[PDB]
Design a protein around this ligand. Structure first.
Ligand SMILES: *[C@@H]1O[C@H](CO)[C@@H](O[C@@H]2O[C@H](CO)[C@@H](O)[C@H](O)[C@H]2NC(C)=O)[C@H](O)[C@H]1NC(C)=O
Ligand SMILES: *[C@@H]1O[C@H](CO)[C@@H](O[C@@H]2O[C@H](CO)[C@@H](O)[C@H](O)[C@H]2NC(C)=O)[C@H](O)[C@H]1NC(C)=O
Length: 486
């Protein structure tokens, strides 16, 4: 029904081996530390994160700009206007600042995060506070300089504990959108230059990635500002992306293929802003991404139907040589991968785990004949070393994956592999309901067991590349014997 060509001869991208990531929002902290519901210690969580490994665990977001390591009564910043209650005098001087005062990142919570990420083969990507600044004068002096004293308190603690081998750093978050000090593109460049100079003093903490500036399409000027100011010291540019407002959306929004292209346009805008930069080919990460902003869509974005945009994003990012995709959030909000209380995995968790199991980092271009875009196809090399695929598929195997938001059955006519052996991994909702919170792999429900991931049951009843309406899945062409994959 649908014509599909895969150019399996030309590698268009090579993503990170650590392609998958999850975000742990800094809004999980309070002045007293984590909210009481937050679980970063259950064996269960270690097993679920391992299922997305090797990957990234991002601690960050808007609230990172009022998080304080080991907050006590003597803290340097406690008497500073941006970290006190709003006054008539400070009420109109900021860019959308929330005046939430100070949250506490406790020593033992930072210990637990290092333990969790090390334990799960995840890197800890920590979002440092950018709104601790000197030189500002209310109503007189707009300019202000990043003050590294807070970051160095955490760096000294890391060195004291022998932490660092799995820690990556970023600084601030969406400065274009929310900022006490109205940070400019030039200031963010200067901030990253200054952080890189500090990290030079902590060599055990400076071997991983320094990424920024964590902006979406309205803030791409800050990517250019960061490239100009500190580009020679930045590993990768972190981008943020959401297709729509989750709060005004419903089940139909999550099936709407007109949204797909929003992601491509973000990548095009970044390439354009960088067109006159030595850093035009700097790796891009999605450092914080989901379908709906404003915490997603209640009782929708934690359900099966979230999977369509989730899968399209994973394939289109990889096709654009975006190295890392960090999903907002591991839990909390309506777009959580897990239930925040039970850690029970939502359908998007299972979709990411299956993608992580079957999909390697070498990427090919897929030409698909469907001007409607209701059917989306991607092709990358089968991952050969996942607990699933180890000694099961071998280098040269191709993983094709696809989604179908149409209300028809589609057959992908992939002539060039006609007569090859197909292993199918088809994800459908329990009870046929798009809002199901339970997902079937080839008719079997995916679930844990004494906190163990279930074995993936491949379906060897091949024959064609077909999707039922409103489904997605992966097809491993075990004997594709693709040269680029060897
Ligand atoms: C910092 O930026 C803001 C926004 O550009 C400036 O103006 C304020 O914007 C906020 C919301 O972001 C409004 O609620 C305020 O009423 C606006 N204030 C005005 C119009 O004065 C703000 O003046 C800027 N501050 C400095 C120091 O330049
Ligand atoms: C859109 O936003 C509002 C919050 O501003 C959500 O309504 C809240 O839902 C929570 C439970 O998740 C309740 O505790 C609050 O009382 C609700 N507040 C209000 C003001 O209604 C709402 O669920 C969101 N809707 C969607 C579709 O995501």
């Amino acid at each position: 029904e649908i014509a599909v060509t895969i150019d399996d001869k030309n590698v268009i991208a090579s993503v990170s081996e650590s392609f998958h990531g999850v975000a742990f929002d800094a809004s999980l902290f309070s002045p007293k530390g984590l909210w009481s519901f937050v679980d970063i210690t259950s064996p269960k969580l270690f097993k679920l994160l391992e299922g997305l490994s090797p990957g990234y665990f991002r601690v960050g977001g808007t609230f990172a700009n009022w998080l304080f390591f080991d907050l006590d009564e003597n803290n340097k910043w406690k008497d500073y206007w941006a970290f006190k209650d709003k006054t008539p005098e400070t009420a109109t001087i900021t860019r959308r600042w929330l005046f939430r005062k100070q949250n506490n990142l406790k020593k033992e919570t930072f210990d637990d995060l290092v333990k969790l990420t090390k334990g799960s083969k995840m890197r800890l990507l920590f979002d440092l506070n950018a709104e601790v600044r000197t030189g500002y004068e209310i109503g007189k002096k707009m300019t202000s300089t990043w003050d590294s004293s807070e970051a160095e308190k955490l760096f000294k603690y890391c060195v004291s504990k022998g932490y660092g081998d799995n820690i990556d750093w970023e600084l601030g978050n969406e400065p274009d959108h929310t900022s006490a000090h109205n940070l400019t593109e030039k200031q963010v460049g200067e901030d990253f230059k200054a952080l890189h100079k500090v990290l030079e003093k902590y060599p055990t903490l400076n071997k991983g990635s320094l990424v920024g500036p964590d902006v979406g399409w309205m803030g791409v000027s800050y990517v250019k500002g960061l490239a100009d100011g500190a580009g020679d010291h930045v590993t990768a540019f972190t981008l943020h992306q959401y297709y729509f407002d989750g709060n005004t959306s419903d089940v139909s929004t999550y099936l709407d293929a007109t949204y797909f292209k929003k992601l491509q346009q973000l990548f095009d805008k970044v390439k354009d802003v960088l067109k006159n930069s030595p850093h035009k080919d700097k790796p891009l990460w999605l450092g914080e991404t989901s379908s709906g902003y404003n915490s997603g869509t209640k009782d929708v974005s934690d359900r099966y139907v979230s999977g369509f945009l989730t899968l399209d994003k994973l394939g289109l990012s990889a096709a654009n040589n975006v190295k890392v995709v960090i999903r907002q959030t591991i839990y909390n909000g309506y777009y959580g991968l897990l239930d925040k209380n039970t850690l029970e995995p939502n359908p998007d968790y299972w979709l990411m785990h299956v993608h992580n199991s079957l999909v390697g980092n070498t990427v090919f271009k897929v030409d698909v004949s469907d001007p409607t875009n209701k059917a989306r196809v991607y092709a990358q090399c089968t991952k050969t070393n996942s607990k699933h695929t180890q000694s099961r598929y071998y280098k040269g195997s191709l993983t094709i994956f696809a989604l179908n938001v149409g209300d028809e059955d589609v057959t992908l006519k992939i002539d060039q592999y006609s007569g090859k052996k197909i292993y199918s991994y088809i994800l459908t909702p329990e009870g046929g309901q798009l809002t199901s919170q339970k997902v079937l792999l080839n008719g079997k429900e995916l679930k844990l067991v004494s906190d163990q991931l279930p074995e993936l049951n491949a379906d060897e009843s091949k024959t064609s590349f077909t999707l039922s309406p409103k489904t997605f899945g992966f097809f491993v062409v075990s004997d594709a014997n693709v040269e680029a994959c060897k």
